[PDB]
Amino acid sequence: SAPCPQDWIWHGENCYLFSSGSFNWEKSQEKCLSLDAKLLKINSTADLDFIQQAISYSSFPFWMGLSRRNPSYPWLWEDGSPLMPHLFRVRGAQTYPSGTCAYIQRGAVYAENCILAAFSICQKKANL
Amino acid sequence: SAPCPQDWIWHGENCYLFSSGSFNWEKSQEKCLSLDAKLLKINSTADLDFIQQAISYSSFPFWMGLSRRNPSYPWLWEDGSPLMPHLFRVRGAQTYPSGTCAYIQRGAVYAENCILAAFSICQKKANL
Q1: CA distance B91 to B101
Q2: What are the disulfide bonds (chains A, B)?
Q3: What stretches of A19-105 show up as alpha helix (H) in DSSP?
Q4: Contact in structure between B55 and B62 (CB atoms under 8 Å)
């Protein structure tokens, strides 16, 4: 009956977890899925503000659920929805084996080869 | 009926919050008290493990509720209880205007002049 499990952070309709380790994007995604969760989807200004404040203590890169299959396609979340207009810019964006993915670091969002390893943030719906 | 409020982390019987800013120890304590909380008290190996993992993404110093009135006295938590034998060592420990206080940084615990500013961690009991 708790909104979120222990060790997660409850914010609004969702629960958030920082990953215990640093892995490539696909593996990061698999680990979120194992927890009945998904990689972070930043869907509003409120979400962006919450995430930026939460990572404000860290200089680490964190994978989110935003990617593009090849440099010719737009940025989409894992659910297929596009990046919300004017929410944030993806900095630093090329062709890699498994596409390009986005991470957030110091509040700013960057494009990177999905094969490289980073920490990640997972989210799932809160029990409300 | 939620164990902890939004933006806090629930762990065991308690809820934890990282401070929104960096202040001297007394002010940090006052801010925890305003939230119906207290500065962090690390009372067990389980607590230490939880806190070390939680701050593992950060190189910031965080004040906890451990202090000594002058360099001649032992380290006590705010509730008056002593530091648990063999839990951790207080590194780097002198006379300052308002005593000496302890902060945790990169998992290790350090002595510092209580007048200097740091982030802090607050805790309160979870509604279970």
Answers
A1: 11
A2: 4-15, 32-122, 101-114
A3: 25-34, 45-54
A4: yes
